[PDB]
Design a protein around this ligand. Structure first.
Ligand SMILES: *[C@@H](C)[C@H]1/C(=C/c2[nH]c(/C=C3N=C(/C=C4\NC(=O)C(CC)=C4C)C(C)=C\3CCC(=O)O)c(CCC(=O)O)c2C)NC(=O)[C@@H]1C
Lengths: 49, 161
């Protein structure tokens, strides 16, 4: 911060970051889980016109 | 209909003359080709269902015609294609055995064009299927004997064009 910048929260403890971004909301799909790439079934594609 | 022998006979009878040396020579040529023709005809009769099977597999399967709404959709229509391809193969074998492609004109091409045009049958797709039949039968009966089968299937394709 120079002589003109108000301070701001620059770093987080891992516990605080977990509290912020480990709830049911705000939790990304890919954080700690296997992200299975959804795809239309091959038979569905074959029968699709 | 007509064959090589009937063609020679009609060629003589149109001018009313008997059979001269040229006619006997043509008949001898046909008799010489007769062994090859019988061989190819018996082989194609034995393997008729197979030939149409691989022709359909390598020419039409997994395509717009087979997809829903396609003309080859609706299993009754698929069986109709199988029957029509069998008809083409059988009458091409007839023409090959006879040596003359008049049976195709008077028993296959007679109204077939109008039939397909009224029915929405893809003429080019049918032609490609017949070409695949020609390739399969040529590979099955050799190059020489397969040449005649290719000639008559090509006659069918050109008439259907
Ligand atoms: C497994 C369930 C069984 C099996 C099925 C199987 N089918 C094919 C290929 C085709 N199936 C059809 C069927 C239809 N077309 C229609 O319009 C209708 C009306 C609903 C039906 C039932 C067709 C047209 C084809 C070929 C053309 C295409 O797929 O677009 C295959 C593949 C065979 C091949 O060589 O490609 C298979 C495996 N086969 C079995 O053995 C099981 C009993």
């Amino acid at each position: 911060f120079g002589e003109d910048t108000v301070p701001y929260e620059r770093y987080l403890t891992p516990g605080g970051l977990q509290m912020r971004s480990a709830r049911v909301g705000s939790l990304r799909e890919d954080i700690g889980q296997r992200v299975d790439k959804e795809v239309t079934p091959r038979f569905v594609e074959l029968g699709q016109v | 209909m007509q064959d090589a022998i009937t063609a020679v006979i009609n060629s003589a009878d149109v001018q009313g003359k008997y059979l001269d040396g040229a006619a006997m020579d043509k008949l001898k040529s046909y008799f010489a080709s007769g062994e090859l023709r019988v061989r190819a005809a018996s082989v194609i009769s034995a393997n008729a269902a197979t030939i149409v099977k691989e022709a359909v597999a390598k020419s039409l399967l997994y395509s717009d015609v087979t997809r829903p709404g396609g003309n080859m959709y609706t299993t009754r229509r698929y069986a109709a294609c199988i029957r029509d391809l069998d008809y083409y193969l059988r009458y091409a074998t007839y023409a090959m055995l006879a040596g003359d492609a008049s049976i195709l004109d008077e028993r296959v091409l007679n109204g077939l064009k109008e039939t397909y045009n009224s029915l929405g049958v893809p003429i080019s797709s049918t032609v490609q299927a017949i070409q695949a039949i020609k390739e399969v039968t040529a590979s099955l009966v050799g190059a020489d004997a397969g040449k005649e089968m290719g000639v008559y299937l090509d006659y069918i394709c050109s008439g259907l064009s």
